[PDB]
Amino acid sequence: AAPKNRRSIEVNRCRRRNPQKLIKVKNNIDVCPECGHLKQKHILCGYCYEKVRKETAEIRRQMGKQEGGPFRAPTTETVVLYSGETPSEQDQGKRIIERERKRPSWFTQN
Template sequence: MIPRINQVLQLLRNVERNLFHNVFGGPPRELALAYVHEKSPSASPSKFSIKDIIGDGILLAVPKFRRTIERRWKRKYGSPDYELKTIVPKTNIKVCQDCGHHHEKGRLCENCYTKIKKETEEIQAKITEKLGINPVEQDVVVLYQGETLPDQPKEFWKGKRIIEMKKERPQWFSKNLLQKTTQQPSKSTDVKPTDLA
């Protein structure tokens, strides 16, 4: 009895679908009615507030679920099932000529940079201690222990400030780093093209 009822219901569905398709040109569209209850206007209209717009909160476009470590590794390294991203060895590693540490070509040696940064911070602390935090408009000459002022005319030292460090100059910290260049700035306005494809 039940299988026959199912067959009859299926037959009626097919007839209804074919009838709507032939008459209206497509499957039946459902109609939905909604009842909206309107509040009666209150005696005193409430003031507009930003809470009416925002409500309880704002939904941001953030991931709803965390990626598992397998998915993260598949995105990073690939997978034999999809695309295997092989780990390519770096060929742009070189040895620093000053300290012997390894670093990438086109980048500063991290070990040398750390030493220079530490020495520079000590010099800046000494300048701040002696001259204060006001802007320093005159040149500052840094002298390490055992160093004397070079023989220069009095006009050269006019307006310069001398900072004395109470330690010996590091071997890697050359005196030439503190001297201004003797090369005159170029007055040429021609720009040479570089890195042309």
């Protein structure tokens, strides 16, 4: 069906300025206590998650370079250690990745 008449600017404004079509303000925005960047209450912080994802990417690159094949999945536990660190009595018998970077503050020794 074709429109019978041209819709006027008053009707157009009444339609596309209605509160249903307007953008709602978000009231769940807070500052991340660690880095001070903005984040939502129910969502992980973007800055911190980017840090963790990047560090995980570097660790995965190291542990994939340690393996010469695509199907060489380790059958034992795995431990990541940084420069100036040695495996403990509990970390023996596992596979070890060594990183030249210092241990990050957020990465707990456990």
